[PDB]
């Protein structure tokens, strides 16, 4: 499963954060800072795969804001990238032309979508349309 998933900007600002492992607040902040420094100090030809703390630190940002994942060494690396791409596509479909400004303003919506997509670090919605329909129905509740 994914221990922690966080979306951070290129400048270092964090736009998303979702950790499935209970860690101390100071320890969590230190881990996030170390992850940001490693991602911020990595080139574009590093394969987007880092083995930090025995965790598959996979970093793949399609825009100025990047995303990071931390999964155990028990599954293939391509699965994490495919899940990240599917989540990005689902978020773009739910929002529509998602930008950095909309992510900050839509932090609650992004968190709800992430919760409805993956819970506890494991994939919960394999389909792409069923999850979107469920998110729309939940939003329409009020």
């Amino acid at each position: 499963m994914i221990h922690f998933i966080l979306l951070f900007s290129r400048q270092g600002k964090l736009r998303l954060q979702k950790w499935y492992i209970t860690l101390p607040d100071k320890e969590r902040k230190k881990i996030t800072r170390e992850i940001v420094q490693i991602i911020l100090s990595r080139g574009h030809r590093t394969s987007s795969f880092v083995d930090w703390k025995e965790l598959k630190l996979v970093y793949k940002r399609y825009a100025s804001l990047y995303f990071c994942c931390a999964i155990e060494n028990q599954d293939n690396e391509l699965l994490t990238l495919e899940i990240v791409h599917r989540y990005v596509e689902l978020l773009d479909k739910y929002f529509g032309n998602v930008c950095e400004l909309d992510i900050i303003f839509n932090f609650e919506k992004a968190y709800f979508i992430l919760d409805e997509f993956i819970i506890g670090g494991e994939i919960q919605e394999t389909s792409k349309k069923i999850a979107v329909k469920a998110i729309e129905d939940s939003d329409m509740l009020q």
Partner: peptide
């Protein structure tokens, strides 16, 4: 800026 750009450009 670079923030208003689409994450995937689709």
């Amino acid at each position: 800026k670079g923030e208003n750009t689409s994450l995937l450009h689709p």
